[PDB]
Amino acid sequence: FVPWQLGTITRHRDELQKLLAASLLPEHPEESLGNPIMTQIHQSLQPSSPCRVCQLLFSLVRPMGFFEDYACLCFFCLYAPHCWTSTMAAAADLCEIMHLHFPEEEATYGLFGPGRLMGIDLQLHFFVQKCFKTTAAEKILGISNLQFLKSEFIRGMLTGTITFKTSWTPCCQITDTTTAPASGIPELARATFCGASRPTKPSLLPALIDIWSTSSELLDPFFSPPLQADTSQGPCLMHPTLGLRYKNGTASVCLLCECLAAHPEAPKALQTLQCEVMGHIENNVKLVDRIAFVLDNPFAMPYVSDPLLRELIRGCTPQEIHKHLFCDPLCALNAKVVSEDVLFRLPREQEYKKLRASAAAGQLLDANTLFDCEVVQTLVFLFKGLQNARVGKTTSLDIIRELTAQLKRHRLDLAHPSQTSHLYA
Amino acid sequence: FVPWQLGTITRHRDELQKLLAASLLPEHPEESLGNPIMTQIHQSLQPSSPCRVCQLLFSLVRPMGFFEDYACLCFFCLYAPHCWTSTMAAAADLCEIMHLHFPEEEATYGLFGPGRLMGIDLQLHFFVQKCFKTTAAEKILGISNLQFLKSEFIRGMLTGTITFKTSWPTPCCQITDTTTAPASGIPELARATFCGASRPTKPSLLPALIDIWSTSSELLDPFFSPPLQADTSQGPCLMHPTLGLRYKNGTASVCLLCECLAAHPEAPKALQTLQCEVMGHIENNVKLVDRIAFVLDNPFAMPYVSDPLLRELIRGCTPQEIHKHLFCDPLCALNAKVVSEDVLFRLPREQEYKKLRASAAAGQLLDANTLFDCEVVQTLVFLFKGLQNARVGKTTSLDIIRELTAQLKRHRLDLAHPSQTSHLYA
Ligand SMILES: [Zn+2]
Ligand SMILES: [Zn+2]
Ligand SMILES: [Zn+2]
Ligand SMILES: [Zn+2]
Ligand SMILES: [Zn+2]
Ligand SMILES: [Zn+2]
């Protein structure tokens, strides 16, 4: 069983349809007193609510093919960026794990939608809170403080306003002066996915473009949206920012972060683009002009094989590319955690079988070895929260002050977060 | 091809008139819902919009001496003050460079105006942001923070209010790197090319200044005819750093002595000699504005100035304009520190000039102005002019003033205290 397979998405087009419909915003929220979808998402974001996915799983465990297939999904999620595509894929792969190991269970059918799992529940379990990580007991209270803050500011993005200064061991491996520097993905994963030997799994770009052009205007039939649904903002309740807002030629749903999780050569295609932008021009041309100059060229970016991804990146505005490579802290967090090999290279069966054994034995899920820091993660969500919701000016500049300090402690070079918050969505 | 030539201005009177017309303010701005000129300038000042001049250039390369003629223009700007005249000259010399090396492409004609280039675009590219300086890649992010601040406060001067403490942050420049020697002058290649009494000077740009600004403004109390429905009391001020002409205490937001620094070959040394006369001749406690009046009442004043036009202009300025320029305004101080009258106005020796161009086209001479170059001090100067010409909160206004005073002392610039200056002058 392997995650991130476009085929798994098409197989469950029926169930996902229930998930995609349930992840759209109401067309006219002001004309109803409530809405059951928003009520449940809002409930998932209250700090003392149960985790609906953790509760589903415990329901099923009170085989062997199951702890080893589930631990694969967890490992893939741990090495995946935070975005819509990762939630879609984790949704599909959770269907498959449930249809594989539990075909007789009623929880397996009608898995998504109102009263069952929702997009936000996937986000919380696999990406925001990472319930699957193996963590020591003495780290539990500390983690809950940070999870509390994340829930509050994510809920703020849903409802529109916020209700830190009171609330705020080295935090991670980077700030750890003892540790040996990060090699890369752990050894067993490098053995299993790496090497010129490997063909690619199918790209998720077609599904992404279908769903989002059908149910939003992000890009100006797998998914059919209802009316009394907001077809201008897409299935954004599966995205970290919970909405689609436009500013300065950018949008709150970053398309290049979607590419990091939906296409096999996006991680490095962008890393080389960043290198071309910094290195080719040797004078004081500003970053959005450098991007226009690099991508003005008719052959632009030959290092990218798939002409579709090339067509997409060259179609982005210089502001979208500026925001993603140099400004937004969540884009920076997304780029540092992804492993394009784990996500998209077809695994070698001999090495994969030990990986499943090791992960289900609880050995590869303690931390993302490329980047893993709940402190920086939390501030990234706090920042996106002040960017997308009403927040007090004084806490707002408190977050900005601390995020900048941590960005430097962790060797992440961005424009100043206050500039980023002025410029972009 | 040599920049800063009155002749270059004269031949392109056609394109340059179109720039001056597009550089006046609306006559009655409140009676229209918008204005395409103001909308575009305001668009050029947003931090994530492209540089129109950079975009013109890349569109033109996507010859063998274009890169060297453009690099000469850049070198001159680097050693030119920030003012109307320097924007006019860069406009003219950009025309000339386009007719020499790109005469069949349509971009060259209709170079200026709505939908094309504007004064703000020339100012941003050649003077405020200096896109041509050779900068290391690892320093770009930091630079964009400072350019952000500059754009915002210049945009405030355009619209009237501002929309620092959040964004503000090794020596910053050669002045505060106290392990280096104190600056002596322009590079050797430039010294060889421009210096020596043997060298004849190019024509004074003062007539062009005096003509254009008297026909389309009141700054002085036909190259250019202004349209109707335009504010003919403020001149082509959208080519000037303050984006308007306002008056206070016998001064105006357009400083005439800064125009002279860029428009006339002996203004830099004349004013520095005047500064010595003002400081040194009186030996008792007479105020600076009276000392200025005493030096310039004498009928034989400033005999070190040969050109009687420059001499009469300086002597006609009010003691506040001269007080403001020599002792108070921080943008006037930066302008005096950056300018080289030799580069701008002495006829180059062609054998050494060929070496200059090769160096400048190879990027070696555009790393930094060796007389003064500090983007920190540049940014604070634009912040201060912004609080002076636009609505800014009291707490952030007094924050700029205190940081600017600290940097002024750290860079050995002796000015009156900026709070005094902000109270006194435009
Ligand atoms: Zn969970
Ligand atoms: Zn950390
Ligand atoms: Zn992104
Ligand atoms: Zn430029
Ligand atoms: Zn300095
Ligand atoms: Zn001046």
Numbering used by the authors:
A (entry chain E): 2 to 63, 68 to 168, 173 to 177, 189 to 240, 263 to 467
B (entry chain D): 2 to 63, 68 to 168, 173 to 178, 189 to 240, 263 to 467
Paper quotes:
In contrast, despite observations that UL32 and its homologs in HCMV (UL52) and KSHV (ORF68) are essential for production of packaged virions, their function in packaging remains unknown. We reveal the structure of KSHV ORF68 and its homolog in EBV (BFLF1), which adopt a novel fold and assemble into homopentameric rings. We hypothesize that the viral genome is threaded through the ORF68 ring, and that ORF68 acts as a scaffold on which the terminase assembles for genome packaging.
We obtained crystals of ORF68 that diffracted X-rays to a maximum resolution of 2.22 Å and used molecular replacement with the initial cryo-EM model to determine the structure of ORF68. Each monomer contains three zinc fingers and several bundles of α-helices connected by loops. The central channel is constricted toward the top of the ring, with a width of ~25 Å, and widens to ~45 Å at the bottom. Residues 435–451 form an α-helix that is anchored by H452, which coordinates a Zn ion at the bottom of the ring. ORF68 contains several motifs with highly conserved cysteines and histidines. The third zinc finger (consisting of C191, C192, C415, and H452) is generally conserved in the alpha- and gamma-herpesviruses (with the exception of the closely related model murine gammaherpesvirus MHV68), but is missing in the beta-herpesviruses. This third zinc finger is also atypical in that two coordinating residues, C191 and C192, are adjacent to each other. Mutations K435A (top, more constricted side of the central channel), R443A (middle of the central channel), and K174A/R179A/K182A (henceforth referred to as ‘3+’, in the disordered region of the central channel) all resulted in a drastic reduction in binding affinity, with negligible interactions even at 4 μM ORF68.
